[PDB]
């Protein structure tokens, strides 16, 4: 029944399993500034941006449906969300992965307004003879705040 040797060692009272001695010191090493939610928020943010761009490109598909609730796919499964296929050999022989993002939690409400406010100003800036480079977005600010709180946690540790 006991499959973990550490639980057995802690139940019996014997010494721990010896490991290789690391030459690095716990104090003389850099901190950690990478939050686990960074990837999960980045992927859904890119998905929302791409869906908004595709709806703007083809307004016929976007028309006739309410922007508040959009049923993209009704066959989404949480178990089959992770799909990996190594057959992708467009440029070189290398593995590939597919992520089935769900539109059930995508917050397109504020994203639609943000995009419709940003494009209307970038077009008039282009008409004014200037090039507009957007400095940052709200999702990037949220990712930066997550990175900041994780860095503060590591600093306190």
């Amino acid at each position: 029944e006991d499959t973990n040797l550490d639980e057995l060692r802690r139940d019996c009272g014997r010494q721990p399993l010896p490991r290789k001695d690391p030459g690095v010191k716990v104090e003389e090493e850099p901190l950690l500034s990478n939050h686990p939610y960074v990837d999960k928020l980045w992927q859904i943010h890119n998905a929302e941006q791409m869906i908004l761009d595709d709806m703007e490109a083809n307004p016929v598909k976007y028309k006739g449906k309410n922007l508040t609730e959009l049923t993209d796919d009704e066959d989404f499964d949480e178990e089959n969300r992770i799909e990996y296929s190594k057959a992708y050999y467009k440029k070189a022989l290398l593995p590939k992965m597919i992520t089935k993002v769900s539109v059930k939690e995508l917050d397109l409400e504020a994203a639609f307004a943000e995009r419709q406010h940003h494009n209307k100003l970038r077009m008039e800036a282009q008409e004014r003879g200037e090039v507009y480079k957007i400095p940052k977005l709200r999702r990037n600010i949220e990712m930066d705040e997550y990175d900041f709180i994780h860095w503060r946690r590591s600093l306190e540790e």
Partner: protein
């Protein structure tokens, strides 16, 4: 598909030991898929530094444009060697000179190389002991503001000594271009 506002920096994030770039400069990956030390992935050749003229630059580089025409061996040349031809000079039956200068005809085995070195022909004096074979480039001299009629040369000139005859030699002031290594750094933002 794509959008009018294409800013791939806002769509790419960099993490520890992980670089995610959105495919849309260009980069290539080896067939094996594993890189190595000092391996080059992206190429960012910029057309801003590109030049149409055949003359190439050789902190800063100097590029002297020269009109070079590669004609076949059986092509009839309407210009003489070491002759000074002006603008719109008919060098061949259907080829006209674009710049005026000294025409140099190098006849190889199976190719006729015609070079037109554009520049002002100047006769150096006796005291002008300029290097015959070693061309010297002159930068913009800081002319004194006292002299009124002193035309300030704002562009650098390349002086080349042309010795067509053993007893008579001429100096040609060819033009120059500016290619600066330190000045000019342009790269599209890849990671936010």
């Amino acid at each position: 598909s794509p959008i009018l506002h294409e800013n791939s920096d806002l769509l790419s994030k960099r993490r520890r030991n992980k670089f995610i770039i959105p495919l849309h400069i260009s980069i290539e990956i080896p067939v094996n898929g594993i890189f190595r030390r000092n391996s080059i992935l992206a190429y960012f050749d910029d057309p801003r530094y590109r030049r149409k003229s055949s003359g190439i630059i050789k902190d800063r580089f100097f590029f002297i444009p020269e009109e070079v025409h590669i004609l076949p061996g059986s092509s009839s040349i309407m210009v003489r060697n070491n002759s000074i031809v002006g603008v719109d000079t008919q060098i061949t039956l259907n080829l006209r000179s674009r710049v005026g200068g000294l025409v140099r005809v190098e006849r190889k085995k199976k190719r006729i190389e015609l070079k037109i070195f554009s520049g002002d022909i100047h006769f150096p004096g006796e005291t002008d002991k300029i290097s015959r074979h070693t061309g010297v480039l002159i930068p913009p001299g800081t002319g004194k503001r006292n002299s009124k009629e002193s035309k300030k040369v704002k562009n650098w000139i390349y002086v080349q000594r042309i010795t067509p005859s053993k007893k008579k030699f001429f100096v040609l002031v060819r033009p120059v271009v500016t290619y600066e290594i330190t000045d000019g750094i342009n790269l599209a933002t890849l990671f936010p």
